[PDB]
Each structure stands twice: as C-alpha cells, then as structure tokens.
C-alpha cells in the first residue's frame with residue numbers, strides 16, 4: 001500500500017535480505033516473500049520480517065497443487081505469519097476454494113494469480129487468463145495478480161475484476177514493465193531486482209516513487 | 213508503530229468510527245479495537261477496518277477467562293482478522309498460555325496486560341503486577357501493556373520485561389497520562405478520547421505527535 005510499491009524480496013540469504021529491506025523500509029510497508037528466500041532461510045523469516053519491519057507480508061508461493069495439499073500449504077503459511085498468499089488459478093476452482101477456505105478460517109487473504117508476466121505465459125496461461133479471472137470473481141476473490149509486461153492484458157483483467165478488487169502487478173523494471181503505465185490499472189506494483197540488485201536500493205526505490 | 217501512536221477506537225457506531233479513523237489515518241498505522249465497538253457493530257468490523265485503512269488491528273478484549281474459553285475467544289478473534297489480542301495476566305499462567313498457544317497456531321501475537329491504568333488498579337492488580345510481568349517473561353511473552361498514568365510503574369515494568377520486549381501504554385490524555393513521559397518507557401502510546409472526542413481528531417493527533 002505505501003507508495004503503491006511492494007518489494008519482491010528474492011535475495012537468498014538472510015543478511016542481504018534484511019539489509020536491503022531495512023534500507024528501503026521508509027518507502028514501503030508491504031514485502032512479498034517467496035520461495036527463493038524461504039527455501040534458503042526457513043519459514044521463520046516471515047515472522048522475523050513482519051516484526052522487524054512492521055510490514056505486511058505477502059507469501060508468493062504460486063500455490064498450484066490439489067485441494068488437499070493447497071489447504072496444508074496455506075495453513076503452514078498463515079501459521080508462519082503471512083498476511084496473504086498468492087495462488088495460481090490455472091489448476092481450477094476447487095484448488096482455489098481450498099485456499100480461500102483456509103484464509104477464511106485464519107482471517108487472512110488470498111491473491112489469485114491470473115496471467116503471468118514472463119514470455120512463456122503466452123503459451124498456455126494467457127489463453128485461459130480471462131476465464132481464470134472470471135472464476136475468481138465467481139468464487140468471491142477480491143485480490144488479484146496480473147502482468148506489468150502486458151498492460152493491455154492488465155487492463156482486460158481490471159475490466160473483469162472490477163474497480164473494487166485489489167490488483168497487484170509484477171514485471172516492473174527488470175522484466176520490462178513500466179511503473180506508471182502499470183499503475184493505470186493495478187493498485188500496486190511489485191518490484192524486485194530493480195531495487196534489490198541496485199547499488200543503492202533506497203535510491204532505486206525513491207526513483208521509482210518519483211517517476212509515479 | 214507509526215508515530216508511536218495507537219488509536220483506541222471506542223466509538224460505538226460504525227459511521228463515526230470509520231469517520232474518525234479515516235481522518236487520522238495519515239498519523240497512525242495501528243488501531244486498537246475493543247468491545248465497545250465490536251459489541252455494537254460486530255466482529256466483521258475488524259476486517260473492514262484492516263482492509264479499508266490498511267492498518268494493524270489490536271483487539272483489546274482484556275481476555276480474562278479460564279484456559280478453554282480463552283482459547284475459543286482467541287480463535288474467534290484471529291479468525292476475524294485481528295493481528296494481536298490483549299490478555300489479562302492476573303487470571304494466571306494457564307490462562308495466558310492458552311492464548312499464546314492459539315497465537316502460535318495462527319501466526320498472531322498476544323499482548324499481556326500487567327497493571328491497569330485506572331484508579332481501581334491500585335486495589336489488587338498493582339500488588340500483583342510485577343509478578344504478572346515476570347510470569348509473562350517466563351512464558352515467553354514479548355508484548356506487554358502497562359499504565360501511562362503511573363510512569364514509575366511503567367518504568368518498573370520495562371525493567372522486568374527488558375528493552376527487547378514491546379510495550380504499549382494506555383491512559384494518555386483523558387486519564388491524565390502524558391505522551392512524552394510515557395514514551396520514555398513504552399514503545400507506543402494508546403490514545404482514545406483525546407483524539408476521538410476532539411472537535412478535530414486529525415488536529416488532536418497531530419498535536420500529540422508534535423509534542424513528542
């Protein structure tokens with residue numbers, strides 16, 4: 001939410017991850033943590049970050065398993081302190097509903113990943129993305145993830161989910177997406193490498209904020 | 213955390229509560245919601261506030277029942293979306309442990325209320341407060357609540373819990389506590405009426421922040 005900028009913290013060691021996150025904390029209040037960091041440092045890193053930085057944590061786990069396993073993944077993730085989890089919609093409605101049920105039980109949120117931002121997304125996901133977004137609307141999903149790299153697709157996604165839904169978007173910077181154009185449709189942009197690989201992460205974050 | 217100021221939102225109707233909270237949101241990022249609002253508008257108000265204001269919510273439920281009931285209260289409260297819950301320590305260790313167990317299961321936090329801020333606290337709670345704080349330390353509690361109205365007691369509490377524990381303090385303003393003096397010992401101050409009954413809540417919040 002702060003500055004409509006979410007940091008994707010994909011460094012793989014705790015010391016560097018804490019250093020960069022602390023350096024840019026005055027610019028953000030929401031950090032997306034994924035498997036690169038969690039599989040290297042453990043799930044306890046989520047609660048550590050949440051406490052140390054007083055930020056919201058979105059666990060980007062691209063959840064994509066059967067219902068029963070998705071439920072277990074969501075339970076472990078919320079137990080670890082995550083405020084929200086990103087779930088793929090392409091595995092179908094039952095898999096998404098399993099995640100929504102756990103989020104309801106635990107007072108948390110599910111973000112539905114519709115279309116991905118990388119080139120390969122055009123092979124199979126893009127053709128199913130509008131229907132995946134419609135499925136989300138039908139299931140009551142209120143939070144979505146769409147691609148910064150294809151603003152016309154981000155626009156179509158926004159059209160399907162409505163103005164009240166919350167939409168975040170990765171692919172800004174390194175993948176080629178533009179901050180300002182992405183924010184014409186998304187509520188917040190996700191930025192990873194453009195900030196965490198910069199010589200001065202704080203200056204990189206400040207520059208993105210200045211550009212928007 | 214923001215400005216070390218936590219709003220105690222004890223208005224009893226949704227419209228006024230949303231109005232004041234929205235007016236002072238630029239000054240805070242943490243709202244304490246208690247029974248005055250929840251029993252008048254329902255537990256759904258917690259998730260509504262959390263979403264609408266993107267703030268952390270501490271449920272001040274002064275939990276004070278037997279272990280089994282405390283567990284149920286904590287589960288319902290975290291399911292409703294609260295980030296933390298305030299629990300009395302005077303009912304004993306088993307009652308506090310029940311709350312800690314649910315918070316661990318759900319990735320949330322427990323704040324232990326040691327000494328209360330009102331005059332009647334001197335009758336029974338004050339004499340047991342140092343031991344209640346020690347009990348908290350022994351149980352692994354990391355978040356505490358102490359009285360703004362008695363800074364020497366707040367100092368003694370801080371001494372027992374250590375500098376690493378997080379301490380919040382009500383009784384600022386209406387009850388007579390001073391913002392600056394309270395912050396010599398507490399990490400954050402809780403302020404209710406001095407802000408929510410003010411003719412201009414934003415100006416009242418701004419003034420408190422200016423004074424510190």
Ligand SMILES: O=c1ccn([C@@H]2O[C@H](COP(=O)(O)O)[C@@H](O)[C@H]2O)c(=O)[nH]1
Nearest residue numbers: 008034116117170171174175191192193
């Ligand atoms: O469609 C998607 C879904 C997720 N991410 C994730 O969002 C972040 C974008 O990082 P970056 O390209 O700004 O470094 C990474 O964690 C990446 O895994 C994408 O980039 N695209």
Ligand SMILES: O=c1ccn([C@@H]2O[C@H](COP(=O)(O)O)[C@@H](O)[C@H]2O)c(=O)[nH]1
Nearest residue numbers: 220246328329382383386387403404405
């Ligand atoms: O020892 C305690 C425990 C809790 N509260 C609560 O903190 C808030 C303080 O509000 P106010 O006196 O600033 O209006 C209220 O919600 C009140 O119930 C106290 O004041 N003192």
